[PDB]
Amino acid sequence: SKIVKIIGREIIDSRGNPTVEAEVHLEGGFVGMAAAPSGASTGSREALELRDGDKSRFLGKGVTKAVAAVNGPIAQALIGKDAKDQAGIDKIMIDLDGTENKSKFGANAILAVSLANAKAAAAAKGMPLYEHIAELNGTPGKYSMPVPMMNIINGGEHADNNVDIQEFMIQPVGAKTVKEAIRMGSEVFHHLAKVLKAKGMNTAVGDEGGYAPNLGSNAEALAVIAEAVKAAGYELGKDITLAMDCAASEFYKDGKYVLAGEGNKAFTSEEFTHFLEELTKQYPIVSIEDGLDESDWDGFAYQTKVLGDKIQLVGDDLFVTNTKILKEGIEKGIANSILIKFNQIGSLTETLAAIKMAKDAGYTAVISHRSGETEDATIADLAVGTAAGQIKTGSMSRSDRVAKYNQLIRIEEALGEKAPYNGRKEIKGQ
Amino acid sequence: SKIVKIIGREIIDSRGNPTVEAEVHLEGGFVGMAAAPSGASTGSREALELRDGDKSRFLGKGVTKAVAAVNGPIAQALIGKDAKDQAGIDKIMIDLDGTENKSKFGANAILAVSLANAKAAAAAKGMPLYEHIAELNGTPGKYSMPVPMMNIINGGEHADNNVDIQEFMIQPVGAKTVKEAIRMGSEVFHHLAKVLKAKGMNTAVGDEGGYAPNLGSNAEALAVIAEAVKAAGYELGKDITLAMDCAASEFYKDGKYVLAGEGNKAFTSEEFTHFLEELTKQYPIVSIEDGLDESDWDGFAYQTKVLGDKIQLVGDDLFVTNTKILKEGIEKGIANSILIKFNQIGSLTETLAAIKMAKDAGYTAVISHRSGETEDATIADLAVGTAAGQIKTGSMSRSDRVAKYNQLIRIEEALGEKAPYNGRKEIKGQ
Ligand SMILES: [Mg+2]
Ligand SMILES: [Mg+2]
């Protein structure tokens, strides 16, 4: 219906840093509240989030400016508009901003309202968000419960150990329902902690709820995980598959990839692609995110030609949820998958556009969370509403992560067979 | 106001363990949803939460039984009843259970429904939860934003260090509103990280979202904290006071109290009462939770006459949220504050009763959280709706904690001046 009021406030995320949370009100008492995850405040590739440089507030990470944009212009600009029309609401906001990277109001402001709007509209139509999204996509009944790749071991910049891979994940492909999948992840999660304690390592979770023990090498990280899956009564490859985020840009120096977890050995773009290939042979690894540097396109073309047929090559920093970039990659045969971060683009409309493009190209879409999350679980409704097939929302710890898993349980509970859990079949190259 | 549907489900908590969530649907489209925090499966004092005990699932932590109780007997015994009468809804459940500790259906099953019911009624009356609560309490006008005692440094059995005290907290008493108080904690929280980071300490957070560094003594814990508050641009005592949870139950043996942190040593219950009296002199510690074992009632009598004058004696494991125990305590002059955990009693009606008896005796009530939380932020609306003045819901990390604060912010933004932030005045003993 019609928007009669838009409220914007400043709340705290899962890491203690401020963030925006819109609240679109429609005629009839209907309301839709949503928050925005942490994003990049700097850079010339992705939509930036506006934070106040005010160092006398949250060490300079406040978002009153962005919040002001919501209450100020954004509000008055959306008042009277038909929230039911998503593309339109996201259009009159991105244009008002004027800039391309949404620097004026900030992506953390446009997204907050963008989502809140969708939820508000979904309420007026007497239906869940995942149902409304499906309609906006033009695929109403087309649902599916996303196969989750759960963070379990952290390394690189997200840890202080001899592990290069930023994060190791597990995928309960053997499950028949997302509910069973979540349980499997929980059990392995707790069993890993047992293995880490026996090894005298720290079991204190991280930002994503996973463990960041001081492992002496990449192999050890893969070993502790393998031992966990077994102790949990599951078989590697059959019940659980392994996914990973290399974040290769982190260990890319002087045109080469230096892995400290490999004894500080150096690898050329081509050599690393073969190093990963060898890993996918000794381990059930079926998904590799950012296996190379975002600029190493020539290398990605090679990695895709060698792994793209059997292993899913997900681009995170490579595509930064951008249609232009992803479009070029598709034509140049770069990768075969993309990680979706709606806060990295700004709106739901654009996010949907990115998911559709990947689908049309044969690429897989992995709806992802962010390091700084909130109670919000929109990505859960987004994954199901667009039948993304896969989701990346953390480990089985910390509500900022588990909130998404609980939402998936609620959703699958109300959809049953209407939203099947395809497991492996969702993973490219499977 | 008429209950038409009530469904229960098994969800995951912030710790990866299963928990119960319930939905109470009322005639007219009104629905309330709430989940219970993790409690105690056994025990002979507090309400017992029901767990399946099947090693095959969730390592025996499944709650399918308690979930059935909600969907089956409980629901069938509530259909058509007036959800608007909280006291009536809980009675039917309490009597249907037929046990003291609610060990038949499980405190978690009843609690989840009891809270979902209240949230449903609130909506049916076109009013928020905190407003419905205040009314059920018989004080529709009273409102107040509680002073949050944010955890920040854990010890004892809550960390692998040398600190005997279970947890150290900070209280943003220097704030004018809970919103600002939250900002203070957020700031203090982040600075302590730099202090530990620079000291080669681990910054990984615990279940509470706080820090578990490898400190060498209680004095050092109070050192890094104080050093953190100052570095943040705040002054102890004036802007940020201190609170701690001794949990003497962890080091109480042979009638004495041992302290590994203070080297192999232990002293009479009388000495420890004076030991703490020293900390309340050297440091701005105004709140001490379980400064003695729950059995040492005589010791508490002295501590109440030694510190009960200028220090707040919060009873957690002492009262375990139970009127039968708090009453006898008030008479014998034991403590002057009680930690409120509704999942420890079983229902909202019984929880309000506990809070009422607290204020009716001068004692202060601290709406608390549990180790295993969820996206649920009910305790936030409970504190306000009852003007408890104090709340213990973790640090400024992990959405399972910050969810409560964000809700507190949303509330203070709606009530405005109606919900005052008394500040240090709330703390019993000022
Ligand atoms: Mg990444
Ligand atoms: Mg306690």
Side-chain angles (χ1 to χ4, degrees), chain A residues 166-167 245 247 289-290 316-317 339 341 392:
Chain A
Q166 179 160 287
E167 68 167 322
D245 183 0
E289 178 186 323
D290 283 338
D316 175 16
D317 174 42
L339 194 71
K341 300 179 179 183
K392 186 179 157 188

Side-chain angles (χ1 to χ4, degrees), chain B residues 51-54 56-141 143-161 163-175 177-179 181-193 195-196 198 200-219 221-222:
Chain B
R51 296 275 172 190
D52 298 344
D54 171 29
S56 151
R57 287 189 50 147
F58 291 103
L59 292 71
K61 275 64 179 299
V63 296
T64 64
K65 296 183 176 184
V67 173
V70 181
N71 289 304
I74 297 176
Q76 295 181 201
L78 288 176
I79 297 297
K81 300 299 184 306
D82 186 39
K84 202 154 61 201
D85 182 54
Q86 189 60 42
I89 308 298
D90 293 330
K91 192 183 197 305
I92 290 179
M93 295 204 271
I94 288 166
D95 289 329
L96 186 52
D97 175 81
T99 77
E100 296 190 309
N101 55 186
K102 306 181 172 63
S103 56
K104 196 195 178 192
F105 298 145
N108 50 345
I110 297 178
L111 190 278
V113 186
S114 166
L115 297 187
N117 176 77
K119 290 190 180 175
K125 317 202 304 185
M127 59 167 82
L129 173 56
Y130 57 75
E131 175 168 13
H132 179 64
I133 294 174
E135 275 189 31
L136 294 172
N137 207 199
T139 66
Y143 287 134
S144 78
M145 301 321 291
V147 174
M149 50 169 87
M150 309 163 78
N151 203 34
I152 194 170
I153 288 297
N154 307 70
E157 269 64 66
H158 277 191
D160 191 57
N161 47 46
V163 181
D164 289 307
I165 285 69
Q166 175 153 290
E167 65 182 292
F168 279 116
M169 308 174 258
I170 55 173
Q171 309 174 77
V173 300
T177 54
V178 69
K179 180 177 172 181
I182 291 159
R183 178 166 66 68
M184 276 187 232
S186 166
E187 280 163 30
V188 186
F189 174 73
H190 285 297
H191 266 101
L192 174 53
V195 185
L196 300 173
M201 309 283 248
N202 203 181
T203 60
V205 307
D207 301 320
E208 305 254 294
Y211 298 112
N214 194 310
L215 299 168
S217 60
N218 308 298
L222 295 161

Side-chain angles (χ1 to χ4, degrees), chain A residues 8-75 77-93 95-196 198-234 236-269 271-277 279-282:
Chain A
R9 67 174 64 70
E10 183 186 53
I11 58 173
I12 295 70
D13 66 26
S14 50
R15 294 194 297 191
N17 298 131
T19 186
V20 188
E21 168 181 89
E23 187 175 308
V24 185
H25 282 73
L26 277 46
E27 41 178 42
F30 303 97
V31 66
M33 184 189 293
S38 77
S41 182
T42 314
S44 58
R45 303 190 52 240
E46 57 185 285
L48 300 316
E49 46 158 32
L50 176 55
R51 282 189 189 281
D52 334 314
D54 200 323
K55 294 180 183 292
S56 77
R57 271 171 50 65
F58 296 105
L59 282 58
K61 279 162 273 184
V63 292
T64 70
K65 287 190 183 71
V67 173
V70 179
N71 298 304
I74 302 177
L78 296 175
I79 295 292
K81 294 292 173 179
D82 173 40
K84 192 140 68 178
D85 171 44
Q86 190 59 41
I89 299 299
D90 287 334
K91 184 263 281 66
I92 45 184
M93 276 197 298
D95 287 337
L96 217 182
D97 191 80
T99 82
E100 173 192 53
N101 61 170
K102 301 173 167 66
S103 291
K104 198 179 172 72
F105 310 134
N108 55 312
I110 297 173
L111 179 82
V113 169
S114 181
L115 298 180
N117 170 72
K119 291 183 181 177
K125 314 205 304 176
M127 62 169 75
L129 171 55
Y130 62 76
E131 192 180 333
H132 182 44
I133 284 171
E135 302 208 316
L136 286 180
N137 206 220
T139 54
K142 196 65 198 72
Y143 299 125
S144 105
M145 303 317 284
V147 174
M149 49 176 69
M150 304 163 40
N151 181 94
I152 198 64
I153 289 296
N154 301 62
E157 290 297 308
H158 290 181
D160 180 29
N161 53 10
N162 202 45
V163 179
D164 310 299
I165 314 308
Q166 179 160 287
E167 68 167 322
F168 274 110
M169 299 170 279
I170 55 170
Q171 303 168 103
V173 293
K176 300 166 294 182
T177 57
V178 77
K179 172 162 174 184
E180 186 187 350
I182 292 158
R183 183 175 65 91
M184 290 172 64
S186 170
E187 290 170 6
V188 177
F189 173 72
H190 290 306
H191 273 287
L192 176 62
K194 300 190 184 301
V195 178
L196 292 176
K199 293 169 66 65
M201 314 202 147
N202 190 58
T203 57
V205 300
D207 274 339
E208 289 151 297
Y211 306 110
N214 183 55
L215 303 159
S217 75
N218 293 299
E220 228 201 316
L222 273 160
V224 298
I225 291 172
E227 198 187 326
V229 176
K230 188 156 185 291
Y234 294 109
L236 257 188
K238 197 261 291 182
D239 303 304
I240 299 171
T241 43
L242 303 179
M244 67 195 266
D245 183 0
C246 292
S249 80
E250 289 310 333
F251 53 73
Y252 185 52
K253 188 174 184 179
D254 306 318
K256 298 175 75 70
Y257 299 89
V258 193
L259 303 190
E262 296 299 309
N264 289 308
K265 197 205 296 177
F267 301 80
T268 60
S269 180
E271 287 177 305
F272 195 50
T273 288
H274 288 300
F275 168 73
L276 289 177
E277 165 173 47
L279 286 179
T280 74
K281 297 295 180 192
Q282 68 182 69

Side-chain angles (χ1 to χ4, degrees), chain B residues 148-161 163-175 177-179 181-193 195-196 198 200-219 221-229 231-237 239-248 250-252 255 257 259-263 266 269 272 274-277 279-280 282-300:
Chain B
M149 50 169 87
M150 309 163 78
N151 203 34
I152 194 170
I153 288 297
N154 307 70
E157 269 64 66
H158 277 191
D160 191 57
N161 47 46
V163 181
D164 289 307
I165 285 69
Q166 175 153 290
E167 65 182 292
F168 279 116
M169 308 174 258
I170 55 173
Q171 309 174 77
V173 300
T177 54
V178 69
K179 180 177 172 181
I182 291 159
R183 178 166 66 68
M184 276 187 232
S186 166
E187 280 163 30
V188 186
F189 174 73
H190 285 297
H191 266 101
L192 174 53
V195 185
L196 300 173
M201 309 283 248
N202 203 181
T203 60
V205 307
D207 301 320
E208 305 254 294
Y211 298 112
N214 194 310
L215 299 168
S217 60
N218 308 298
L222 295 161
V224 284
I225 291 175
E227 191 197 320
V229 180
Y234 292 102
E235 56 181 304
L236 298 175
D239 294 318
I240 299 172
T241 52
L242 295 179
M244 60 191 252
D245 183 320
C246 303
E250 297 309 78
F251 48 73
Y252 181 56
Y257 294 87
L259 297 174
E262 310 290 294
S269 175
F272 188 54
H274 293 305
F275 174 61
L276 304 175
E277 183 174 47
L279 301 170
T280 61
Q282 319 152 180
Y283 301 97
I285 303 172
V286 299
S287 186
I288 309 173
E289 193 181 313
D290 290 321
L292 295 169
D293 194 75
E294 59 69 48
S295 63
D296 208 315
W297 270 50
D298 278 54
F300 273 123

